[PDB]
Amino acid sequence: SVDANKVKFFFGKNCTGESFEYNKGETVRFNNGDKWNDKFMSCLVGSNVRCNIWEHNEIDTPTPGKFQELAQGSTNNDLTSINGLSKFQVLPGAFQWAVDVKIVNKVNSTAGSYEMTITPYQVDKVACKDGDDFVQLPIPKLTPPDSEIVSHLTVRQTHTPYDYVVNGSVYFKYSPTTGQVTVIKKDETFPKNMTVTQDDNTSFIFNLNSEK
Numbered sequence: 001s002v003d004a005n006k007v008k009f010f011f012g013k014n015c016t017g018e019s020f021e022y023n024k025g026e027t028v029r030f031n032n033g034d035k036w037n038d039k040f041m042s043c044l045v046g047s048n049v050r051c052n053i054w055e056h057n058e059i060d061t062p063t064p065g066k067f068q069e070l071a072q073g074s075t076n077n078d079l080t081s082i083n084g085l086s087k088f089q090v091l092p093g094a095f096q097w098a099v100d101v102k103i104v105n106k107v108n109s110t111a112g113s114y115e116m117t118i119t120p121y122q123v124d125k126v127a128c129k130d131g132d133d134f135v136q137l138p139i140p141k142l143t144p145p146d147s148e149i150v151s152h153l154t155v156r157q158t159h160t161p162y163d164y165v166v167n168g169s170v171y172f173k174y175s176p177t178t179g180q181v182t183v184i185k186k187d188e189t190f191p192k193n194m195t196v197t198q199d200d201n202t203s204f205i206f207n208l209n210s211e212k
Contacts, residue, residue, distance in 0.1 A: 002044040010042035024049045024092035040085035047073030050091035055083040057201030067178045096141035100134035106209040115158045120151040145176035165212045166194045
């Protein structure tokens with residue numbers, strides 16, 4: 001059986017082949033280079049845990065890439081029409097979507113001396129350093145879902161001299177059409193020292209060229 005509170009993956013039609021287990025509130029982005037990604041064939045989802053399966057991800061193309069929200073509880077026995085796999089996101093039945101963010105040393109050499117702490121609209125602050133697999137921020141359905149979300153961003157050193165590197169705000173938003181995630185950045189809130197580029201759908205990468 002599948003847990004109501006966890007999810008599990010099956011590497012053959014009719015829950016066969018190989019078997020895999022997954023925690024709630026986890027995001028895993030495989031590459032087309034690993035055949036172990038295309039090994040996806042079945043899966044099983046509890047009842048209090050969302051699952052999100054994406055194959056194509058783009059941010060200018062007019063053709064909507066293959067996307068499917070796996071129902072918060074069900075079995076997935078034949079889903080070849082989903083186009084195999086490339087990205088999976090598991091949500092703890094509490095967030096409608098989530099977003100991966102990571103820092104990148106564009107000034108330092110070790111990298112593991114900086115920490116980014118971001119706090120969207122009354123969300124649990126999450127502190128990540130240059131030594132993680134893109135920290136996941138929990139985002140509700142909002143109202144409306146195409147509405148923007150205020151987020152304070154504070155980048156500070158993990159250790160001495162413990163100085164502040166960035167102390168500004170950023171706007172996040174998703175398009176409730178194909179799970180398209182986007183970031184709005186304007187001189188009204190956005191700082192002038194760190195920038196963020198959309199390395200993939202739901203996957204952002206912040207580059208730190210300054211050293212405040």
